[PDB]
Paper text:
Here we report that under nickel-limiting conditions, in [name], F420-dependent electron-donating proteins (Elp) are produced and form a complex with Hdr. The Elp–Hdr complex forms a supercomplex with Fmd or Fwd to perform electron-bifurcating CO2 reduction using F420H2 as an electron donor.
To further characterize the Elp–Hdr complex, we performed cryo-EM analysis of the 1-MDa fraction. The complex is a dimer, (ElpABC–HdrABC), of heterohexamers. Cofactors including the electron-bifurcating FAD of HdrA and the CoM-S-S-CoB-reducing non-cubane [4Fe–4S] clusters of HdrB show conserved architecture and coordination.
Numbering used by the authors:
A (entry chain C), B (entry chain c): 1 to 185
C (entry chain A), D (entry chain a): 149 to 576
E (entry chain B), F (entry chain b): 1 to 283
Amino acid sequence: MTLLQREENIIRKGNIDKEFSEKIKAAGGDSLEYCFQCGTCTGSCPSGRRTPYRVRQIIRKANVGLKDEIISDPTLWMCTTCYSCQERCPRKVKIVDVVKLARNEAAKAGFMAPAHKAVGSFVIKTGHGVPINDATMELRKAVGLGELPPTTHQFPEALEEVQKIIKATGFDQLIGYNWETGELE
Amino acid sequence: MTLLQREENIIRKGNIDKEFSEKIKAAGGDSLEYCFQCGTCTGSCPSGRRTPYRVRQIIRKANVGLKDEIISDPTLWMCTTCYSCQERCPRKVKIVDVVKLARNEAAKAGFMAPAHKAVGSFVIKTGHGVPINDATMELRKAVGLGELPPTTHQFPEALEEVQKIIKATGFDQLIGYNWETGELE
Amino acid sequence: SVDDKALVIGGGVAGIQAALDLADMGFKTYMVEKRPSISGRMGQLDKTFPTLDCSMCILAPKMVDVGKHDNIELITYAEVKEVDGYIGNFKVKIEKKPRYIDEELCTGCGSCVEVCPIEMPNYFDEGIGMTKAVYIPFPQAVPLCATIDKDYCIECMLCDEVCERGAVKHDQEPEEIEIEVGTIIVATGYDAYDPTEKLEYGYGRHTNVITGLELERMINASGPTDGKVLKPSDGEKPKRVAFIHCVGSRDEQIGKPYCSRVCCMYIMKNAQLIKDKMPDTEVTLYYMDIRAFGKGFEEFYKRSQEKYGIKFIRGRPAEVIENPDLTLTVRSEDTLLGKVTEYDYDMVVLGVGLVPPEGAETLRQTIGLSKSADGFLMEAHPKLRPVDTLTDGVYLAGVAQGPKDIPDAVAQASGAAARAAIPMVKGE
Amino acid sequence: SVDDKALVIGGGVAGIQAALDLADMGFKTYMVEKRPSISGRMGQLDKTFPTLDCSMCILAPKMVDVGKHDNIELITYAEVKEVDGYIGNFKVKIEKKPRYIDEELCTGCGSCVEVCPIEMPNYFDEGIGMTKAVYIPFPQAVPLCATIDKDYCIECMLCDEVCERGAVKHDQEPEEIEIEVGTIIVATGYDAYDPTEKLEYGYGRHTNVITGLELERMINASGPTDGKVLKPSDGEKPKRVAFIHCVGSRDEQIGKPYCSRVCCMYIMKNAQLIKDKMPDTEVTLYYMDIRAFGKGFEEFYKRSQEKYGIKFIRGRPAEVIENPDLTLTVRSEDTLLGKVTEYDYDMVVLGVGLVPPEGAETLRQTIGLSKSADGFLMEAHPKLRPVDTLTDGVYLAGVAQGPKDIPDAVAQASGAAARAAIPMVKGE
Amino acid sequence: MEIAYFLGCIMNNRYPGIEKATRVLFDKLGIELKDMEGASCCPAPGVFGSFDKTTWAAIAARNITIAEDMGADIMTECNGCFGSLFETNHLLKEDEEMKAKINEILKETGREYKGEVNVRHFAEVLYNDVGLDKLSELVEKPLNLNVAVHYGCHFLKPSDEINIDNPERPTILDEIVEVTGAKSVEYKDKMMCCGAGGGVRSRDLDVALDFTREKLTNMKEAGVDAIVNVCPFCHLQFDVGQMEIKDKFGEEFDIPVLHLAQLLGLAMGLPKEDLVVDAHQVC
Amino acid sequence: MEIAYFLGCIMNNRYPGIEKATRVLFDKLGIELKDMEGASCCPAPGVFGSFDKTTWAAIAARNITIAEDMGADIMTECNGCFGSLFETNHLLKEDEEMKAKINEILKETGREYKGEVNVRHFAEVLYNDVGLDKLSELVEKPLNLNVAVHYGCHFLKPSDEINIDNPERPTILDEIVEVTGAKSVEYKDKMMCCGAGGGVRSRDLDVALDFTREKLTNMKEAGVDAIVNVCPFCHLQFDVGQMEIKDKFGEEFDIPVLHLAQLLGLAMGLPKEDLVVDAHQVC
Ligand SMILES: Cc1cc2nc3c(=O)[nH]c(=O)nc-3n(C[C@H](O)[C@H](O)[C@H](O)COP(=O)(O)OP(=O)(O)OC[C@H]3O[C@@H](n4cnc5c(N)ncnc54)[C@H](O)[C@@H]3O)c2cc1C
Ligand SMILES: Cc1cc2nc3c(=O)[nH]c(=O)nc-3n(C[C@H](O)[C@H](O)[C@H](O)COP(=O)(O)OP(=O)(O)OC[C@H]3O[C@@H](n4cnc5c(N)ncnc54)[C@H](O)[C@@H]3O)c2cc1C
Ligand code: SF4
Ligand code: SF4
Ligand code: SF4
Ligand code: SF4
Ligand code: SF4
Ligand code: SF4
Ligand code: SF4
Ligand code: SF4
Ligand code: SF4
Ligand code: SF4
């Protein structure tokens, strides 16, 4: 197989979105402007040790403005938000905030895993990311707790309020939730 | 598809062959000891612009001793030996010599392309990397030159001398040339 | 027996400080400067790192002090021709070049400049500024006196007829001065590296490639552009500027294996000043190491990023290509992204290093001093005698001893004053 | 009226140079040093970059000169308690701590040291060397006199019985000295950053993690290991050594945003010295920028690679893990390979930075000086008055004004001598 | 003392033993746990924070307004829920424009965030409001257990905002654990993440399980008897992921996973039935 | 004078017009070209140098001994062959151990390398031994042609060893070309490699063709009429690769490729048949 690849091995202005960098900085990632690429973050990163995820390089790309490279990157979703890097960064960059903002842009670009959308749909339907099941219902009953916890599981009005918030923020549209059928699109 | 890869995303002593670095340095690549990774070589490299080949990183790996990573790397064969990097290196590293020594080690490890073996076999059979064909015999005849050039094509004894050199250096065994059959295997 | 007089060679900040320290200590001091005015390179700067304070505002008072000090004999536009003898007993022969202007009569009014019809380059503007065949290098010059360059004068006599002090003397001749001194302080400074030989960067061929010192002159409000950073090609502001570090330094391909030690800082300073003047300008630096080692320097670096949004690319550029529209493409690896980049810019500034000045070898041989491996003057001991030389009675001050910034040079000049005063105080 | 006497506070290379320059200029000079002997940190070093020349070999003659100079009164083991007045009219109150040894009678023979039964740490060995409750910090000490530490003395009187000069005085009391001077030169130096708070690097918990200054003592032939670099855990040579740059510097997580300016060079120097002593040792440096900015420094860096085969990894280590066998794994990205590395080492050396010395605030308030952002003393003007302070008659010299190497400190000390001599020469 | 009690999802819906042990413990301590009626997912920061900051913040603000209406501070037993709610609280308190946006969203529900209550972690409440002495008094049977304490990440980090203990080398959980007679055993990479945060468990199960496998190997070489955590998210990762690791790679560590509340209840002589170990996949 | 004539492979076996033009030109100049009977592949540095240094050096040393027997310097008009032979010569001359090893290998052939002759490039010989004035004299018809000069990498590099001209901005070939009346047109990335060196043409044809396509685009935007080279390897890359590019991507550059010898013959009024343009794939 040839190794020729004329766009993946060079960076020109056509790969750069300056408005993306400005949007990230204005939304709370402004500190990314001033890391000096020491690599402490990558050294601290537990996901970097077992995947191709390189947090230092994500910060670098965000500064350069390589939007398409960042948001389409699967490795972006390898960060557990353990904050170890952010605890150690000598320039006090808010790394985790930058990662989450990049993830928000990626989600807006359609790079959402089906499982994450399933969690979103569970929250829409029941108000819980991890809804209760029958076995836990009976187990709660056994130890004298209520069959249902005093949560959106018990109060339909609370679920209605949560669903109103989700509609108002557009989150249902972000994950392609269909209200009529209660399924994902 | 999982991104998990336990061995490809971390460097430990198990990935390092120090004897390899010593062998490279003793064979004429000793200057690789002192580049300070400025990246001038990569910037000058025409193959680096269109393939994943990164000459600076090859030099770095040679210094670290990542033998298995270097010799098995297909990108190692993307260098045309244009010498532009070597002309510009601020530390006067003999980059092309390092690349060729790494290639010799790779060939010894069995990473030889079939086409390169074909060139070797052409030299073994005829003494020319690009042997003459019928049409060129006709043109040579028509333009007043001899039908055959005064080379190993004309003189069998010269071809036998070349083949003796090839046997003495073991090159026939390097490319798997079988003398009885005249084939590669 | 030790003569209680001193000679200071060079009229930069180092020489100025040494002379003022010696004079304030009571010793009679000669100062020989080859240019028509003292100031050296500091007077050419617009601002100084790391404070961004104006250089002329703080240098000019010292120059005035030198020009009016009772214990200082200032001989500008002159050069040391011979040195004989030893410590306490130096006989020095100086040649005052002819100004063709009477230093005692000239007031520096500038009328002769206004009337002269011949234009010529101003050395103070480093090749990007013009003046007349009769000129005053800059308004704060000390002495504030005119000079006529005979390689450009056509002997029109308009300056002669316009002057009211009768200061123009077309028949002036070079003057020989002989002095006796007990000590000598060499403070001859440096020259900016000329990058023409760096063919891949294209200086002298590409229109919009300039040096850092040229940029200093262009930023300076009293410079030839009235402080505006303008593209040489069209005279408009550059929307995109690249700076390249280590030009002429840390490079064995040109036999310059040393670090020029100030380039990183003045690069960042000029970038900050450009951003201050033109906040919309995009500025990018190609570096290998950021050497922000001085007091406040690391903070200056952080501020370059946090406050001004200056972009830093770790990569020594391979090439600068001029496009048909005269924009410039810098081809360089970003070693931290690990990828080749080809970025476009409207102007490229080469961070040229520091080299010994023109004529350094001649003066070194005249005095009889030794030079270090980097071509600058060698001190007696690199750890404990940084301003002494193995030639007793001769001391070093400022960049003459090697590249360094203003406070380090000033400290060296004060130290050399002390070390020279010691033998003169002893008297033998 | 300006008193023609000077006070120099601190007995390091900067203070020594300032005092000798003032004395050679004829001014009577007091020197006050809190340790029992002068030398400062320079006397602790084994060799000096970039020449690898012996530090003590060149420092000791100057210390002797200070101890025998007619114009210098040396008051060691003493501290400035009060300062009143102004330029030319300073009244200073000094407290000479009790040695419990008579400086005039003690010859420094060392018999009392041999006979003492109580062991205690030697401050000169930076926490890795032992001596007795009665001690001489190092054989080249000036004055060459003993000192008894009463926190460890058990009053056994063996030292009294063994001494022949009758120099032991267990009944000695602190002595109050009052002096009048016209100028003051603060040359109080620095302390090595203590990295205990850098929990991820494990200093003070991991057995085989040491600082650069500790390594200086271990390398030194007169040190507590007879110049052998030995693992603290087992007393054997380390086959693999890592150096970590910028420890305590360039780090906002600990409020140290400045570059300590010397750690890159002394790191490379000690790596070269280790290789020289043990050519088979593997040595690796984790750095961010190599700041080899000085004369010959870039060449020193190249030589570290070409001659000695020292490995350079561009990456600020995330963590140092102690293994069960007490080897150390450094976890760090190699930013130029773009990959995480976990490399094993037998010893790890932290390149600690420079900080103001213990008690700096008290003396600063006693004199009344201002401090810069980095915690060191502030000069009157960062470009043109590097050794002056806004307090007239008080000057700065050496690392007191900020981190810097020996030649720069020596130049500053000479300059401060000049600047202080000027008012004293004027006399008013 | 009174405190609003936030449950989250995993504890109330997968491991009710943790909730029961907590309720009994706080009843023994004289602290009134007041239910947060109508509470929902906090929501989990890993997914919602990664997808849309505004939705995450609005849901968390509604959860906070429940306690504000009740007029009490919030107590959370989950690192994940604590991180979500605490972050939302301090973000809305320190930023007026975002508070206005969130309240504009909340106006449809008839609620309004006021910034009147604090969010507190279960361990912090135990350590500060109760103290180690009172906890030691309530112990009925010292435990002979070698435990590996898993702090998790969002208990203490970001430390600049949370300011509970030193993230690199904390001791608070270790001290609470040793109050029970159990020994907290040091092990390699003790502060490492369990791999479940940031949505990684659902996005790439193999990567998260690799985190867990590394941690379990380090705990096993330290010879511990159980894992102690203060996070039902981490609790689920360890418990279910031990089964997943056993089924995937054939490696079984069989190390029990206990929430800190369950450990305290065991030391305090709680009924075995109240500790719902039937919910745990690891026996 | 007299000089040994090394042919290589590509010139004598694919483009004999280059050889015929060279022979006629040198006959007109009073320089005796002496055949190197029994010569083989130089051998091509890209493959043999990459595979085994010893084999490459031994074969090159045998080629050099062929000329040493005649007591004449070697002249090559191929950048590749010049690089191979010149490098081998200066390696064996400057290293005694390697010379001993190579001669030990050569014992079988009955030859011995002595280090007695020099290796010289065709252009260097023309520029220095003949000079521009004599070449200008031999011109019979000035050419009205816009030419793109392709230096090729191994003519001048490594410059430390070769020391013929400045590799970044050379002029020697341009001056020789303009002696014929043709105009050397500057074009972007003029010094760039053609992509065929180092074995790349045979290993990854697409990459080498991408080099050639970039170069051809830059030449076309400069409006040149032909390419002039001093390397049959470069000649073949440009000629055959224009056809390969047309077949693969449909790009049609249609720029003739001429060796410098052929250009000089054209300016010198040599017969058209002697140029043997029938060998060129590009018309
Ligand atoms: C672009 C640039 C920006 C800089 N910015 C800063 C900055 O912001 N801050 C900072 O601290 N430093 C800065 N520097 C460094 C600073 O310029 C030097 O530290 C300082 O100028 C050295 O002064 P000097 O007196 O030693 O030498 P110079 O300034 O070179 O003065 C030497 C003098 O000697 C004269 N002379 C030379 N040869 C002879 C001779 N043979 N006979 C008589 N006279 C002679 C010269 O004409 C001149 O008047 C910068 C340097 C450059 C190139
Ligand atoms: C590990 C290491 C290696 C180094 N290696 C080199 C090298 O190779 N080359 C080089 O050039 N530089 C080197 N340096 C830098 C060098 O140590 C300093 O530049 C130099 O020591 C500064 O000397 P100083 O006199 O200013 O201060 P110091 O050496 O610190 O001396 C100050 C003196 O003042 C005394 N003092 C302090 N406070 C008081 C007080 N209140 N009253 C009285 N006395 C007081 C101290 O006890 C001491 O005697 C190194 C530094 C370190 C940490
Ligand atoms: S640790 Fe901080 S300064 Fe260093 S590379 Fe990461 S984000 Fe940048
Ligand atoms: S927060 Fe994300 S990038 Fe930072 S150390 Fe944890 S997993 Fe790595
Ligand atoms: S140009 Fe030279 S010094 Fe720079 S990275 Fe390449 S080989 Fe190393
Ligand atoms: S010689 Fe190889 S690595 Fe160097 S510039 Fe040419 S192709 Fe790139
Ligand atoms: S020469 Fe005359 S006109 Fe010119 S500046 Fe001097 S005084 Fe003025
Ligand atoms: S005489 Fe010379 S200097 Fe005077 S005005 Fe004429 S040209 Fe100018
Ligand atoms: S000071 Fe900076 S730019 Fe100048 S030579 Fe040194 S590293 Fe390069
Ligand atoms: S106290 Fe006495 S024994 Fe001890 S060093 Fe002094 S003179 Fe010698
Ligand atoms: S009296 Fe004190 S100093 Fe003297 S020997 Fe006894 S313990 Fe040591
Ligand atoms: S001198 Fe070097 S090691 Fe020290 S703080 Fe500066 S960059 Fe770091």
